[PDB]
Design an enzyme around this catalytic site. Structure first.
Site, PDB file in Angstrom:
ATOM      1  N   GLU B  58      21.079  -9.705  25.964  1.00  0.00           N
ATOM      2  CA  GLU B  58      20.511  -8.364  26.239  1.00  0.00           C
ATOM      3  C   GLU B  58      21.232  -7.682  27.619  1.00  0.00           C
ATOM      4  O   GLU B  58      21.683  -6.418  27.544  1.00  0.00           O
ATOM      5  CB  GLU B  58      18.965  -8.361  26.240  1.00  0.00           C
ATOM      6  CG  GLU B  58      18.565  -6.978  26.167  1.00  0.00           C
ATOM      7  CD  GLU B  58      17.222  -6.752  26.622  1.00  0.00           C
ATOM      8  OE1 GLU B  58      16.533  -7.344  27.429  1.00  0.00           O
ATOM      9  OE2 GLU B  58      16.393  -6.170  25.859  1.00  0.00           O
ATOM     10  N   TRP B  80      16.027  -6.120  19.219  1.00  0.00           N
ATOM     11  CA  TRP B  80      16.198  -4.501  19.001  1.00  0.00           C
ATOM     12  C   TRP B  80      16.105  -4.027  17.677  1.00  0.00           C
ATOM     13  O   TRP B  80      16.338  -2.657  17.336  1.00  0.00           O
ATOM     14  CB  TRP B  80      17.237  -3.994  19.737  1.00  0.00           C
ATOM     15  CG  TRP B  80      17.153  -3.815  21.188  1.00  0.00           C
ATOM     16  CD1 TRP B  80      17.335  -4.828  22.103  1.00  0.00           C
ATOM     17  CD2 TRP B  80      16.375  -2.747  22.015  1.00  0.00           C
ATOM     18  NE1 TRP B  80      17.140  -4.485  23.597  1.00  0.00           N
ATOM     19  CE2 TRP B  80      16.500  -3.374  23.330  1.00  0.00           C
ATOM     20  CE3 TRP B  80      15.977  -1.566  21.711  1.00  0.00           C
ATOM     21  CZ2 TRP B  80      16.022  -2.304  24.463  1.00  0.00           C
ATOM     22  CZ3 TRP B  80      15.630  -0.778  22.744  1.00  0.00           C
ATOM     23  CH2 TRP B  80      15.564  -1.046  23.838  1.00  0.00           C
ATOM     24  N   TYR B  94      18.962   2.333  27.706  1.00  0.00           N
ATOM     25  CA  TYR B  94      19.420   1.556  28.667  1.00  0.00           C
ATOM     26  C   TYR B  94      20.556   1.713  28.996  1.00  0.00           C
ATOM     27  O   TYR B  94      21.110   2.364  29.928  1.00  0.00           O
ATOM     28  CB  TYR B  94      18.936   0.137  28.628  1.00  0.00           C
ATOM     29  CG  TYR B  94      17.397   0.001  28.842  1.00  0.00           C
ATOM     30  CD1 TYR B  94      16.728  -0.591  27.638  1.00  0.00           C
ATOM     31  CD2 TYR B  94      16.807   0.296  30.022  1.00  0.00           C
ATOM     32  CE1 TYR B  94      15.301  -0.639  27.687  1.00  0.00           C
ATOM     33  CE2 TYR B  94      15.565   0.052  30.064  1.00  0.00           C
ATOM     34  CZ  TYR B  94      14.513  -0.275  28.978  1.00  0.00           C
ATOM     35  OH  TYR B  94      13.388  -0.455  29.093  1.00  0.00           O
ATOM     36  N   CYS B 146      11.014   1.368  29.184  1.00  0.00           N
ATOM     37  CA  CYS B 146      10.110   0.581  30.045  1.00  0.00           C
ATOM     38  C   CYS B 146      10.247   0.290  31.371  1.00  0.00           C
ATOM     39  O   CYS B 146       9.460   0.445  32.536  1.00  0.00           O
ATOM     40  CB  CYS B 146       9.499  -0.562  29.274  1.00  0.00           C
ATOM     41  SG  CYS B 146       8.947  -0.321  27.682  1.00  0.00           S
ATOM     42  N   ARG B 166       7.198   1.183  33.997  1.00  0.00           N
ATOM     43  CA  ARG B 166       6.206   2.229  33.615  1.00  0.00           C
ATOM     44  C   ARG B 166       5.066   1.588  32.844  1.00  0.00           C
ATOM     45  O   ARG B 166       3.916   2.109  32.731  1.00  0.00           O
ATOM     46  CB  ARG B 166       6.713   3.349  33.017  1.00  0.00           C
ATOM     47  CG  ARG B 166       7.133   3.202  31.528  1.00  0.00           C
ATOM     48  CD  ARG B 166       7.507   4.393  30.911  1.00  0.00           C
ATOM     49  NE  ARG B 166       8.387   3.898  29.580  1.00  0.00           N
ATOM     50  CZ  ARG B 166       7.417   3.799  28.278  1.00  0.00           C
ATOM     51  NH1 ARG B 166       6.365   3.789  28.198  1.00  0.00           N
ATOM     52  NH2 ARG B 166       8.167   3.728  27.482  1.00  0.00           N
ATOM     53  N   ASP B 169       3.547  -5.127  29.059  1.00  0.00           N
ATOM     54  CA  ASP B 169       2.955  -6.248  28.475  1.00  0.00           C
ATOM     55  C   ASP B 169       3.031  -7.402  29.223  1.00  0.00           C
ATOM     56  O   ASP B 169       4.122  -8.132  29.382  1.00  0.00           O
ATOM     57  CB  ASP B 169       3.606  -6.188  26.910  1.00  0.00           C
ATOM     58  CG  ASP B 169       2.763  -7.274  26.015  1.00  0.00           C
ATOM     59  OD1 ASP B 169       2.243  -8.157  26.383  1.00  0.00           O
ATOM     60  OD2 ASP B 169       2.948  -7.358  24.829  1.00  0.00           O
TER      61      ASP B 169
END
Lengths: 264, 264
Positions: B58, B80, B94, B146, B166, B169
């Site tokens: 990633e 994804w 991103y 995120c 922001r 989890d």
């Protein structure tokens, strides 16, 4: 304030020698966080007298979105004079990004309106954010935003806000930076029929100028006083309709003001 | 890790009941910070087995800037898939923002290249930042980032990085999020002939899903193991030329993996 003096002592104890853009030395740490429960009282530094006249005017100015200093000058607020061109322009700093963030497809996005209606309609949202960090606009700004990004959060009827400050002058800047965002939380909470939660302050390069050491030592020798109380004298019809005279601080009993200089 | 388990215990102790966008319940706090000295060891959670195969791929994918999942699929990385359209597109998430942030005047700004040369040429800079929070692009993204914003800092030959997340989890996301940015710091430091400093993690809405409580209680009953060590087997000619096989983790002796589900 306790959290603020603790920050100052940490920079003193653990800061590394670090120069700024002009070559002016500092002691610096990277990464810090503080939390102010706004129901405890309004988070205005008490260990030196801190005037908010300029801060209130600047915040109303940000919210209005016009980045010309004319409104500040109307009110003899001179804190942006250093950066403004001969026409009083600053380029697309803070207010422009807050109220009119420009997009590739030629739109201008009102982030303040966006956030307000998100807080009213979708208070659980984890993406209630205002950003000043518009990468394509940085070069035209008189300088890059120090208060880069802020996020809001709602739980248990209470509005919280976290600010990311990329660069923090702990002595001269920070007392004012805290006050400004604390004020904004109160205003937004009022407009959203919410109580005030926490103001969470997050710093990047968090530093004490070497020529503020005399002042830092003095302020550290002082005991914080009870926090004062913010009074909003009137409920305006929107976030954009606040006036300078709407704000009063009660019960502010600071230690004397402490002057600190800047290099050029 | 100590800091991570302390975070988990805090969310348990102090988190308020808070739903997500799907209506799935969580315990939530707003504003948290942790610091990982990268010279202590590579900050990979040890209290459950955490696989990095997908994380490494990633990160290389982010750095390449193409937001189609084809490269991930080439490598059977499926993380994804949930967000991708029928052509494998995600919109301008991103990598697009990192490598090709679009501007109103029709330019595309390479923030990774920007930061690299800033770190090499002006390491004192207080404005070495990458942002994914492109306001005008949010609607076209499969979802809002995120990991919104990160800032670098150099002092005493050491590269540090602070990430603003922001939404976090804590159980499922955070171990991986820490590993990803920790890896990036190592890569950037190598390319800039710097040592590794601190990875500073900053959270907004930082939460434990209610259906992760069994798992959280289990993991909390476990003692952290010594941190493992990251080995970069080769020095590539740039930040864009890393390969999957370049990375090895040594001395990783985790407690067993712990599965946790998602709602739909």
């Amino acid at each position: 304030m306790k959290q603020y003096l603790e920050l100052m002592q940490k920079v003193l104890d653990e800061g590394t020698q670090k120069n700024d853009r002009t070559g002016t030395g500092t002691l610096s740490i990277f990464g810090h966080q503080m939390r102010f429960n706004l129901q405890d009282g309004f988070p205005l530094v008490t260990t030196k007298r801190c005037h908010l006249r300029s801060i209130i005017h600047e915040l109303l100015w940000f919210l209005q979105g016009d980045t010309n200093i004319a409104y500040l000058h109307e009110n003899n607020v001179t804190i942006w004079d250093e950066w403004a061109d001969e026409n009083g322009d600053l380029g697309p700093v803070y207010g422009k990004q807050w109220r009119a963030w420009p997009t590739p497809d030629g739109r201008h996005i009102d982030q303040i309106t966006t956030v307000l209606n998100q807080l009213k309609n979708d208070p659980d949202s984890r993406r209630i954010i205002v950003s000043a960090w518009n990468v394509g606009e940085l070069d035209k700004m008189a300088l890059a935003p120090c208060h880069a990004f802020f996020q809001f959060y709602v739980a248990d009827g209470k509005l919280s806000c976290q600010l990311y400050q990329r660069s923090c002058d702990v002595f001269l800047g920070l007392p004012f930076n805290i006050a400004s965002y604390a004020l904004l939380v109160h205003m937004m909470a009022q407009q959203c029929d919410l109580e005030v939660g926490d103001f969470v302050w997050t710093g990047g390069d968090t530093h004490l100028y070497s020529n503020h050491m005399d002042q830092t030592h003095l302020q550290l020798s002082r005991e914080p006083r009870p926090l004062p109380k913010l009074i909003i004298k009137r409920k305006p019809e929107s976030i954009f309709d606040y006036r300078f005279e709407d704000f009063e601080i009660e019960g502010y009993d600071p230690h004397p003001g402490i002057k600190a200089p800047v290099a050029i």
